[PDB]
Amino acid sequence: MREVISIHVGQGGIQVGNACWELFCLEHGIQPDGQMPSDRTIGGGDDAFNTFFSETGAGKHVPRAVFLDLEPTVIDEVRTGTYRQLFHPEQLISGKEDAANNFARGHYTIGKEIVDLCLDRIRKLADNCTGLQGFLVFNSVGGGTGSGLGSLLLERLSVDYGKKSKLGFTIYPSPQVSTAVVEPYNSILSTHSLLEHTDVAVMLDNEAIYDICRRNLDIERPTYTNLNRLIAQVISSLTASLRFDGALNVDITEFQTNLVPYPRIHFMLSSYAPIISAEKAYHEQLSVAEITNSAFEPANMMAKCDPRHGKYMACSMMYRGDVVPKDVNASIATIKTKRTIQFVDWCPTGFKVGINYQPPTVVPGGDLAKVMRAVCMISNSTAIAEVFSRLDHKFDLMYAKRAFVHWYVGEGMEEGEFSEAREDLAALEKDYEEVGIET
Amino acid sequence: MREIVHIQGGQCGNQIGAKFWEVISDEHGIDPTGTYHGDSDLQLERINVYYNEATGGRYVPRAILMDLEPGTMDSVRAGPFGQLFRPDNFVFGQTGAGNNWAKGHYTEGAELIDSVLDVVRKEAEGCDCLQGFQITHSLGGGTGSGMGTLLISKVREEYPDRIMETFSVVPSPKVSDTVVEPYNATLSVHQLVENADECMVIDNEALYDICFRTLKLTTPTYGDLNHLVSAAMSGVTCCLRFPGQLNSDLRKLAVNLIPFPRLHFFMIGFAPLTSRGSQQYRALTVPELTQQMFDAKNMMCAADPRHGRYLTASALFRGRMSTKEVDEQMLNVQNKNSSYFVEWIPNNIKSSICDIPPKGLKMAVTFVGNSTAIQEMFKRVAEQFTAMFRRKAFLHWYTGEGMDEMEFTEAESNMNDLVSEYQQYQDATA
Amino acid sequence: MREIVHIQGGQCGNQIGAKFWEVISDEHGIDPTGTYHGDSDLQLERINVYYNEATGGRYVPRAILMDLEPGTMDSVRAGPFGQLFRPDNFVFGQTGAGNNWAKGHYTEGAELIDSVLDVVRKEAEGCDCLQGFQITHSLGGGTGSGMGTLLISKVREEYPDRIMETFSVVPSPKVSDTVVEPYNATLSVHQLVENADECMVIDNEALYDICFRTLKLTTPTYGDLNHLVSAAMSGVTCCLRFPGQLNSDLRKLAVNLIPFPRLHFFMIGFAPLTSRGSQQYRALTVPELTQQMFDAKNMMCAADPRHGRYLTASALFRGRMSTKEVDEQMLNVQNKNSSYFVEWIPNNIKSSICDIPPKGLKMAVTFVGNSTAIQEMFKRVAEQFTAMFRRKAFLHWYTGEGMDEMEFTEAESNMNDLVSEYQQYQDATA
Amino acid sequence: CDKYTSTALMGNWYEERLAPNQPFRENLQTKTVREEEAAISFASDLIPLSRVNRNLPWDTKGVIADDGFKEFRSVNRTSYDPINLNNYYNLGDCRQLYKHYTA
Amino acid sequence: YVSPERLNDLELILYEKIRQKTLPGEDEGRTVYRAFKYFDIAEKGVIDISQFKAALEKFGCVFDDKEIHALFSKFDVNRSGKICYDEFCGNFARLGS
Ligand SMILES: Nc1nc2c(ncn2[C@@H]2O[C@H](COP(=O)(O)OP(=O)(O)OP(=O)(O)O)[C@@H](O)[C@H]2O)c(=O)[nH]1
Ligand SMILES: Nc1nc2c(ncn2[C@@H]2O[C@H](COP(=O)(O)OP(=O)(O)O)[C@@H](O)[C@H]2O)c(=O)[nH]1
Numbered sequence A: 001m002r003e004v005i006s007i008h009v010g011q012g013g014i015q016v017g018n019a020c021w022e023l024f025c026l027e028h029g030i031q032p033d034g035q036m037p038s039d040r041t042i043g044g045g046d047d048a049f050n051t052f053f054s055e056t057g058a059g060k061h062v063p064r065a066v067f068l069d070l071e072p073t074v075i076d077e078v079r080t081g082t083y084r085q086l087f088h089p090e091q092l093i094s095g096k097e098d099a100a101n102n103f104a105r106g107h108y109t110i111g112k113e114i115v116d117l118c119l120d121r122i123r124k125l126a127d128n129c130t131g132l133q134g135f136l137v138f139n140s141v142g143g144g145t146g147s148g149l150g151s152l153l154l155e156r157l158s159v160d161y162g163k164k165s166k167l168g169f170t171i172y173p174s175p176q177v178s179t180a181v182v183e184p185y186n187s188i189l190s191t192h193s194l195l196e197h198t199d200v201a202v203m204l205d206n207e208a209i210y211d212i213c214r215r216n217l218d219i220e221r222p223t224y225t226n227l228n229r230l231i232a233q234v235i236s237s238l239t240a241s242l243r244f245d246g247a248l249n250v251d252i253t254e255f256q257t258n259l260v261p262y263p264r265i266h267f268m269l270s271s272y273a274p275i276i277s278a279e280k281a282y283h284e285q286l287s288v289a290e291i292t293n294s295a296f297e298p299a300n301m302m303a304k305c306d307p308r309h310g311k312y313m314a315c316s317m318m319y320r321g322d323v324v325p326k327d328v329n330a331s332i333a334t335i336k337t338k339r340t341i342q343f344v345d346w347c348p349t350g351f352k353v354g355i356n357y358q359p360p361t362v363v364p365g366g367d368l369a370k371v372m373r374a375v376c377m378i379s380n381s382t383a384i385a386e387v388f389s390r391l392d393h394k395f396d397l398m399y400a401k402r403a404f405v406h407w408y409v410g411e412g413m414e415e416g417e418f419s420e421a422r423e424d425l426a427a428l429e430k431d432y433e434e435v436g437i438e439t
Numbered sequence B, C: 001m002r003e004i005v006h007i008q009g010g011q012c013g014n015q016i017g018a019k020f021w022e023v024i025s026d027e028h029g030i031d032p033t034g035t036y037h038g039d040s041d042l043q044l045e046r047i048n049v050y051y052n053e054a055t056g057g058r059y060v061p062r063a064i065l066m067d068l069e070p071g072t073m074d075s076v077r078a079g080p081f082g083q084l085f086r087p088d089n090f091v092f093g094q095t096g097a098g099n100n101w102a103k104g105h106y107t108e109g110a111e112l113i114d115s116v117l118d119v120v121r122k123e124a125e126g127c128d129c130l131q132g133f134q135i136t137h138s139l140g141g142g143t144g145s146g147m148g149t150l151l152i153s154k155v156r157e158e159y160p161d162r163i164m165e166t167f168s169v170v171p172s173p174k175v176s177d178t179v180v181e182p183y184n185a186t187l188s189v190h191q192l193v194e195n196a197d198e199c200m201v202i203d204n205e206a207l208y209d210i211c212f213r214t215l216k217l218t219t220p221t222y223g224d225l226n227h228l229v230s231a232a233m234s235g236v237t238c239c240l241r242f243p244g245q246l247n248s249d250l251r252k253l254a255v256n257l258i259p260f261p262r263l264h265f266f267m268i269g270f271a272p273l274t275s276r277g278s279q280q281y282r283a284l285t286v287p288e289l290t291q292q293m294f295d296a297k298n299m300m301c302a303a304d305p306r307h308g309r310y311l312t313a314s315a316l317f318r319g320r321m322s323t324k325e326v327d328e329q330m331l332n333v334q335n336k337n338s339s340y341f342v343e344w345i346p347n348n349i350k351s352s353i354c355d356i357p358p359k360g361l362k363m364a365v366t367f368v369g370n371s372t373a374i375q376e377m378f379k380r381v382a383e384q385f386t387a388m389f390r391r392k393a394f395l396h397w398y399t400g401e402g403m404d405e406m407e408f409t410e411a412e413s414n415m416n417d418l419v420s421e422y423q424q425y426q427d428a429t430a
Numbered sequence D: 001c002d003k004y005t006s007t008a009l010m011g012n013w014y015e016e017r018l019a020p021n022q023p024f025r026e027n028l029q030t031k032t033v034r035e036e037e038a039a040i041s042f043a044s045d046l047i048p049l050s051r052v053n054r055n056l057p058w059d060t061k062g063v064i065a066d067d068g069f070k071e072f073r074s075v076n077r078t079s080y081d082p083i084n085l086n087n088y089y090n091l092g093d094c095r096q097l098y099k100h101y102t103a
Numbered sequence E: 001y002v003s004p005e006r007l008n009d010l011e012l013i014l015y016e017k018i019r020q021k022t023l024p025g026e027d028e029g030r031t032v033y034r035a036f037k038y039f040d041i042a043e044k045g046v047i048d049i050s051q052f053k054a055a056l057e058k059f060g061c062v063f064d065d066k067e068i069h070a071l072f073s074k075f076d077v078n079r080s081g082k083i084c085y086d087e088f089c090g091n092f093a094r095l096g097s
């Protein structure tokens, strides 16, 4: 009865949609062709797949997902991949010409001819839905169509539907490990649109997850498929409470009332634990106290940001497995005790705890081992102003000489739009500075 | 499916195009008779990018072969893979250019250009979604340097927004085949800057140096230089035809490489290149590829890259690899060589990954770079031009075909301004 | 069942008719001896339109053969497919015309035409429901241009409600084979506009140009031109003989192509046409068929259709195809060339589909177009006529059979009036 | 080959012993390569273009030759590989208590 | 069991729909080759009866399993139960010429 709609746009958004939809089908025991294999299921999970799948009347189940991109390369390969028979044939919208790493192309010239189709598909999906909870958007901001089309979609959705909650899993460029050269231009402009249109933002940079794989899994040769599985695991843990029995259930609306103190401050960063391979897993204790301690370790964090340089505002605990509520309270109290991790004065209580009985599910051919306990941590902190600081530094350095500007003005963008994006992030960066002061 | 059309003019352009089509047909598994005999399904998914389909299951390339003399196209038809090209795609005169720019651009080229323009228009309107143009010619000759740039001007006037690519074999003073190169070379470079979106300069001397030092083969010929140029050209557009992790088309290269509208003269290179005697003694790892890629002696230009500073650069990795090493190696080469990269731009290297390497190879990389070391290429050409022009030598042929000294004066002034504005960034500091 | 009889006069008319009947016999699978040897019942279902019934189940065409000189019919009897013609239909003169309109229209034509009029009357009365007449002749000769048009006048007098077709070959200034052609050409045009319901101008110049340029064969003969004309003649009336998605007959074409009764001079073309070395390099599709249909160089007249404005247009398709493709192709060709279509008659193009392609082809197109650019031919012919007439050259031959200068003057005035009407309706606006 | 005819240990002798055949070099008498014929298509100026017997194609293969790598695989194709899902299904808990044949 | 002059009608109906679905500038043989190579996974070149039924179904032709055997039996000359779709596409391209 309760379910969410997922948005996957751009090259980065689709390629992480491959991993998550692999896990959701596997977690409910759904074959890639869509037929549940029975096997005396007799409603084993019964009514639990409506969050991510809908019955077709006789047999197969179809996901509540839509795919967008202006380059048919990634869309076509999904249509010819192992999951060809799963997705709806007309829900894999494919463009004609790629945005070509340009913000203006995907927002003013070719991005306006695809939104009409996408909005129609969302409307049809919503009408079939009955207990709509919100939207989940996956996109990459350091690119053309991801930042371009994604920003256009967010503006259209906010007016058409209104108060429905939106959560964005963005991918900002790393401090030094990055692909494109003109990405600061697109990254700055996209933050302008998403600041007043989304409700929860999670930072999912690339360099931080490279360190996680090397330090934990001891993988010196990682690719994107390794990273996407880690991001997919976070999504399932975050939304597990919506579709499984739990001692303390938290739905997506118990996030904005628990993690967002002010309307302009809704940017957060995530962490996940335990992260161990199949060789070292069975020689270790993996106690609840240890998994909750490693989640707060700064190098275990999923974004390249050091929490010791800032304070804390609100934290969310999402446990799954065989955890006991008494153990969680004792472990949490030790976290508050140590002086290295310091909170903010005006927030005497800062932990929201949710407990689920479902143990983590392991994908065959993966890197993680089958464990009995896991935790997902979402933290709102003032240290996030660090990553915005360096993006501003990169923008100003290459904008003083108007480099690469003619690529933007020649597509439809006005030159004055660059100044506005600078000012709002200039305002935003000092909002975090002002809140961090003490009374 | 975002197709590209091909145009080749002059003797050098025709030979380069023939070798390129041979390489592309071999890679896609198309026999000299035009019948598909490939191995995997991936070779046919995007074959429309380079080939048209006709009744009988045969594939014909969409290329236009143009010259003012029938000498070279007789040769391309007689040679191998000469039956692929459509007989309707050959246009020619009877006189030839004779290494005179005016003859190929004002009198004889203009008279013949209508038919080739008609053929180009028909071919362009045939495809569903045009993506751009690619040109192979030489600026040191008559019919190429003039007639090709006239066609470039016309087609750019007709199609304003499509990307245009040129592979110009600019002359070099170490190896000289003509006594009148500076005039028409300067004129063509003047005419090319206002129309071409991307230019990739090539020297015969540079490829001779590569063949002598890297391949270590005693007596190569134009066939091997043509093969190297064809390999680079094929490697440029790998992502437009094969799936990968980070797809980048022609337009994505231009945005990431062109900071200002008049700075679009690049230099290219290819890797790996090994001699026949040392093939099996080297490992296949990403560090080897980037080490050979940033080799100063591995470029396709006589100019030394380490005499200037790169503005931007691009690398197009092919084959199955780990993305982490790509980024780490780019960061390391950008850090240990911070003196050779301009400081007021951060992360001035772009990387792209394709899943399908060339046949018989595991990993291959194509490098495109935009540096300030190209200016010596124009510096020496203009130096010869003024020395030849002070005495008005060899000028009466040009002036006897409706051409005036004013055009030469304009051409030489444009070269100086381009060099100045292209080199001032080397000394400019933030 | 709405059958049509065939009339051909003069040497040119006989040569056209022989190959036309050869092509029709091949289409319907009739051997040279008149015995059916077909494969499908559709070939025999509608045989009565062209062939009568005779002994032994053999078929004979309902064609009348006429000329004043026996040599041409002596040749056509011994030519290929010469045994189909009934010996009674041969009508012969004993002297000849000698390229004289007066001789072929007043003295010998008048005394000879009674027998052929009786023969054609018998043939017309034989059929249960006549559909019309079609005539093939040349307007530059004497016997054809005179006696054929006198027969046209008599037939129009006797059978008013039926329709008349005239496949007429008019001379051009470039390929000229007669000195006295302007006189009888103008006189024949003035007589033809009187009675002919539809006129389809054919130029030997245009046929030679097509053979030289499109088919690219070095040594054309009159047989190739006859074959092209015969292909067009078979195509124009295919749907009346074979089933299709949208049936269309000659009366329907006349209704949809004739806005005013004095504007009935069409210009025709046929597609596709390819050389032997280019058959395998091209794909046969509706876009290419409709691209070749409207090509100016593909037409069978010296007039350029882009010098004027189309008033109406028609297209007849053969083979199996989707109707939506045809509809959108005609819509696109009308939209992209809005400057070449007069604007006070919207949707000035017609379409028809037949599902039986010609032998050896899968799809075929016949185009019939009414345009105001056809007036240039009449202008140049009248210019030559008046230049020759101001000095009364060669006028004694014409005045020696009772004809006077009043007929010349009235013919010239009527020709000028027709040209003026064409120009006036071309430069007309809403 | 340094002013010699190989088989002599002169400068740069080791590499050229591996040059495959180069048929052009030792057969400069044949010429031929006369397979164009009077095509009459490609072209007409009506005179077909004059043809001249061209020479041998000169080997090539300057780019590094094959290393016995067929390749033609995609990272996404090999990453998911429904064999993995097949093995995590309709299988397991096999410890070979008694001896039995299995696929 | 049913085998009158009805398999020919079913083949004619089958041919029209491939021509209807055929991409521009391509033969019906390539289009049906793409469908069979889409369904098959073993890449050996032969499929079973259910895959053939699904291939017919994607074209939009709906029939009961009874005649699916009848069509398959006509094409499977060797009675082996495995069909080489190469000959299938070749025959349908010849009929579509
Ligand atoms: N972690 C991760 N990041 C990705 C992945 N795919 C793309 N990205 C990010 O996307 C950024 C560049 O944008 P692209 O995804 O290549 O393309 P795009 O965002 O769709 O925009 P266009 O280039 O116009 O198509 C890179 O800097 C990557 O960090 C992925 O699979 N995993
Ligand atoms: N690299 C390379 N250069 C070539 C080839 N053929 C000709 N050239 C160069 O082209 C130049 C001559 O240009 P030319 O043919 O006269 O130009 P055109 O008169 O416009 O056709 C010479 O300096 C050669 O170095 C080739 O196959 N490869």
Ligand SMILES: Nc1nc2c(ncn2[C@@H]2O[C@H](COP(=O)(O)OP(=O)(O)O)[C@@H](O)[C@H]2O)c(=O)[nH]1
Binding pocket: C009, C010, C011, C012, C015, C016, C097, C099, C138, C140, C141, C142, C143, C144, C145, C169, C176, C177, C178, C203, C204, C207, C222, C225, C226
């Ligand atoms: N296209 C074409 N033109 C022809 C043919 N035969 C004759 N002509 C033209 O007709 C002209 C002579 O016409 P003529 O035979 O005197 O006409 P007639 O007096 O009525 O028989 C010549 O200039 C030829 O060009 C033919 O078979 N095809």
Ligand SMILES: [Mg+2]
Binding pocket: A010, A011, A069, A070, A071, A098, A099, A145
């Ligand atoms: Mg994209």
